[PDB]
Amino acid sequence: XLXRXXX
């Protein structure tokens, strides 16, 4: 979720 380069 933090960041889709990857939660």
How far apart are alpha carbons 1 and 3 in whole angstroms?
Answer: 6
Residue type, 7: X
How far apart are alpha carbons 5 and 7 in whole angstroms?
Answer: 10
- Which residues contact residue 7 at a Cβ distance below 8 angstroms, ignoring those fewer than 6 apart? 1
How far apart are alpha carbons 1 and 5 in whole angstroms?
Answer: 10
5, two tokens: 């380069």
Residues of the chain immediately before an interruption (C to N > 2.5 Å): 3, 6
Q: What are the DSSP calls for 1-7, one per residue?
A: -------
How far apart are alpha carbons 3 and 7 in whole angstroms?
Answer: 7
Would you give the distance in Å from CA 7 to the centre of its chain?
A: 5
| Coil vs helix vs strand at 1 | coil
7, two tokens: 């939660």
